[PDB]
Design a protein around this ligand. Structure first.
Ligand SMILES: Nc1ncnc2c1c(-c1ccc(C(=O)Nc3cc(C4CC4)ccn3)cc1)nn2[C@@H]1CCCN(C(=O)C2CC2)C1
Length: 260
């Protein structure tokens, strides 16, 4: 299967602490550069996680973080992925030294929209889409990661992911691809806001109340009326009125072509 021999891994440097444990940079078989995420003990429903992991291993798309294998015959569990040099997109946006161009911001939205259109086509829900869960490689390409892992988190008022959730999730936990749509719109807002906190002046519970009342994030300065109309369309009250990732990608492609 997708089992990797942990004895063929080398830990050269700890890149930081992510969701479900620490992440290392090392070599696989002394040939390939990889990132090894060590699942912290007691942070996930490991049995359910290992099975579904095999399903996620078969998901293949350029804009999804490439999964190489796992190390489940031991503890802590190891996840071997490709090394994204520029790390977390959120910290990447909050790096003013990069001086992102508007065209680059739209390119980052398209990268994420490609992966979500693929996940949508396979009927796989991410359920925690946000800049913090996206990664960037040396070439500046954004890729989606941690898709579908919140299902196996072990919880140990309103929590932080409320700021990326539509009303039906806040009130009923009715997760669907349409709730990924909403979250993607907030992701576009983070991008064009260069990592700004959504609803920065509000607590989690207050954000939930304002969302249920119809409050929407404002138009970022770096976003044109055309771009803001796309991210704003992810925020229709009725889940069935929100466009699919097919339409979102189609819209983003149209704007990019006009800017060509
Ligand atoms: N690959 C990287 N390359 C460079 N850095 C990386 C990573 C990662 C990483 C590694 C693996 C995974 C994973 O398991 N995804 C997955 C698995 C499955 C498996 C069930 C089948 C299913 C879906 N997604 C997710 C993130 N994390 N990190 C830094 C961590 C610390 C914070 N970071 C920062 O940048 C801030 C310091 C600035 C990023």
């Amino acid at each position: 299967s997708w089992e990797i021999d942990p004895k063929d891994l080398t830990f050269l440097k700890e890149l930081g602490t992510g969701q479900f444990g620490v992440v290392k940079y090392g070599k696989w078989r002394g040939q390939y550069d990889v990132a090894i995420k060590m699942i912290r003990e007691g942070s996930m429903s490991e049995d359910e996680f290992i099975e579904e992991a095999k399903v996620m291993m078969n998901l293949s798309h350029e804009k999804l973080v490439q999964l190489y294998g796992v190390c489940t015959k031991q503890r802590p569990i190891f996840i071997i992925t490709e090394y994204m040099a520029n790390g977390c997109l959120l910290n990447y946006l909050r790096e003013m030294r990069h001086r992102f161009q508007t065209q680059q911001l739209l390119e980052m939205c398209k990268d994420v929209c490609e992966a979500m259109e693929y996940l949508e086509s396979k009927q796989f829900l991410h359920r925690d889409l946000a800049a913090r869960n996206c990664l960037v490689n040396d070439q500046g390409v954004v890729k989606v990661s941690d898709f579908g892992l919140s299902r196996y988190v072990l919880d140990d008022g309103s929590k932080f992911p409320v700021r990326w959730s539509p009303p039906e999730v806040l009130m009923y936990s009715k997760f669907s691809s349409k709730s990924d749509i909403w979250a993607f719109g907030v992701l576009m807002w983070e991008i064009y806001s260069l990592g700004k906190m959504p609803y920065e002046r509000f607590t989690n519970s207050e954000t939930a109340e304002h969302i249920a009342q119809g409050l929407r994030l404002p138009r970022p300065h770096l976003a044109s009326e055309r771009v803001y109309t796309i991210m704003y369309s992810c925020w229709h009250e009725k889940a069935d009125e929100r466009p699919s990732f097919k339409i979102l990608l189609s819209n983003i492609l149209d704007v990019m072509d006009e800017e060509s």
